Design an enzyme around this catalytic site. Sequence first.
Site, PDB file in Angstrom:
ATOM      1  N   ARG A 105      16.852  -4.876   6.779  1.00  0.00           N
ATOM      2  CA  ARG A 105      17.892  -4.072   6.138  1.00  0.00           C
ATOM      3  C   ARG A 105      17.397  -3.454   4.837  1.00  0.00           C
ATOM      4  NH1 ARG A 105      23.343  -7.394   6.567  1.00  0.00           N
ATOM      5  NH2 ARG A 105      24.200  -5.446   5.703  1.00  0.00           N
ATOM      6  N   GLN A 126      32.508  -3.247  -1.537  1.00  0.00           N
ATOM      7  CA  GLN A 126      32.152  -4.367  -0.692  1.00  0.00           C
ATOM      8  C   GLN A 126      30.803  -4.163  -0.041  1.00  0.00           C
ATOM      9  OE1 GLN A 126      33.403  -4.942   3.366  1.00  0.00           O
ATOM     10  NE2 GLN A 126      35.173  -3.685   2.749  1.00  0.00           N
ATOM     11  N   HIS A 183      30.216  -8.198  -3.037  1.00  0.00           N
ATOM     12  CA  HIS A 183      29.504  -9.004  -2.049  1.00  0.00           C
ATOM     13  C   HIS A 183      28.017  -9.066  -2.353  1.00  0.00           C
ATOM     14  CE1 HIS A 183      32.994  -8.016   0.915  1.00  0.00           C
ATOM     15  NE2 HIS A 183      33.232  -9.134   0.253  1.00  0.00           N
ATOM     16  N   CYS A 227      10.339 -23.927 -11.127  1.00  0.00           N
ATOM     17  CA  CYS A 227      11.280 -24.061 -10.016  1.00  0.00           C
ATOM     18  C   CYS A 227      10.590 -23.902  -8.665  1.00  0.00           C
ATOM     19  CB  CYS A 227      12.454 -23.088 -10.146  1.00  0.00           C
ATOM     20  SG  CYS A 227      13.706 -23.317  -8.861  1.00  0.00           S
ATOM     21  N   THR A 260      37.287   1.475   4.407  1.00  0.00           N
ATOM     22  CA  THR A 260      37.317   0.050   4.716  1.00  0.00           C
ATOM     23  C   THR A 260      38.381  -0.260   5.745  1.00  0.00           C
ATOM     24  OG1 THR A 260      37.744  -2.182   3.906  1.00  0.00           O
ATOM     25  CG2 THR A 260      38.542  -0.361   2.629  1.00  0.00           C
ATOM     26  N   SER A 261      38.091  -1.272   6.566  1.00  0.00           N
ATOM     27  CA  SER A 261      39.039  -1.684   7.592  1.00  0.00           C
ATOM     28  C   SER A 261      40.154  -2.566   7.050  1.00  0.00           C
ATOM     29  CB  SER A 261      38.309  -2.408   8.726  1.00  0.00           C
ATOM     30  OG  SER A 261      37.528  -3.475   8.216  1.00  0.00           O
ATOM     31  N   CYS A 282      35.117   9.585   5.365  1.00  0.00           N
ATOM     32  CA  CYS A 282      35.179   9.542   3.910  1.00  0.00           C
ATOM     33  C   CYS A 282      34.513  10.753   3.297  1.00  0.00           C
ATOM     34  CB  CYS A 282      34.459   8.305   3.406  1.00  0.00           C
ATOM     35  SG  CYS A 282      35.547   7.093   2.795  1.00  0.00           S
TER      36      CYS A 282
HETATM   37 ZN   LIG Z   1      14.849 -21.286  -9.030  1.00  0.00          ZN
END
Ligand SMILES: [Zn+2]
Lengths: 267, 4
Positions: free
Chosen positions: A70, A105, A123, A177, A215-216, A258
Site C-alpha cells: 500500500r 478517516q 485512523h 529499544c 464516506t459510507s 466527491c
Molecule cells: Zn521502541
Amino acid sequence: PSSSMADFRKFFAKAKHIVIISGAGVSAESGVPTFRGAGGYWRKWQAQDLATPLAFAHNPSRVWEFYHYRREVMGSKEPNAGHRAIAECETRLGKQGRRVVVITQNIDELHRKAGTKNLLEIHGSLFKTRCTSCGVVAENYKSPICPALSGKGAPEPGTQDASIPVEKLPRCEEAGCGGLLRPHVVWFGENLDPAILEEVDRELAHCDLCLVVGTSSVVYPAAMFAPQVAARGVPVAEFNTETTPATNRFRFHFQGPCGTTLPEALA
Amino acid sequence: FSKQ
Ligand SMILES: [Zn+2]
C-alpha cells in the site's frame, strides 16, 4: 435531505469555521485501493482480515507485506479534484480569518499531498510506524521500509508469503529499544487515540458548518461525529455516491462522486 | 470508542 446547492452556498458564504469529514470515497476517486468493497482483495484477503490485531499477532510479516504494497502504490497515486478543492478552500479562507479543518478517516495522506495543513488523521497513516514495545510513533517514507520487504507485497492471488522473520521486519531505532514496529494505523476493533479524539471534539464543538464527504457512515466512532454537530443547530452536508444509514440526519445530500460535487460547493 |  435537501438537494439545493444554492441553499448550501448561502451557509458557506458566512461560515467562519468549517469541519470537513472525509472517508474512503475521496481516496477511491484517486484510485487508491482500500480493500474494503465487495470484490476488493489483496491476494486472498481484504482489509477486514488484515487491518486487524489478529492478523498482526498471527502473521506480522503478512501484515507488513500488505502495508508495504500500500505504501509503494502511493507513488503512482495523486490527489483528485476533491482533495484540491478542499486544500484551496482552506488556503483561501485562512487569508480571510476563516478556519477549515479536515478530519479524515483515510490513511493515504493525499490531503497533505494536496496542501491541506489543518488535518486530523483519525485512523493514522501508511507513512507512520508505531513501536509495539515502547509505543513511539515516527514518520517513515522509506521505499522499502526495511530491506527484507524489497520487491515484496505483490497482490496477485497465488503469490507466496514472504515469511520474513520478525527480526528482519521494521525495528524501532530508539536507542535501547529495537522492538517490532507496526503500521501506525488504527485497526478494526482498536481504540482511536484519545488525544486525537479530544482535538476532534474541540473542532466539532466550535464549527459553524460541517461537510461529510465520501464516506459510507458505517465505521465508528467516525460515523458519529457529523451527527453530533447537527445537535447544536449546525448544518451538515453529505457528498457521497449513494445514501448511507446516516443520510436522513443531515441538512443536505449531494449525490455524485466527491471530485464532481465538492469543487462547486467550496468555490 | 473503538473502530468499527
Ligand atoms: Zn521502541
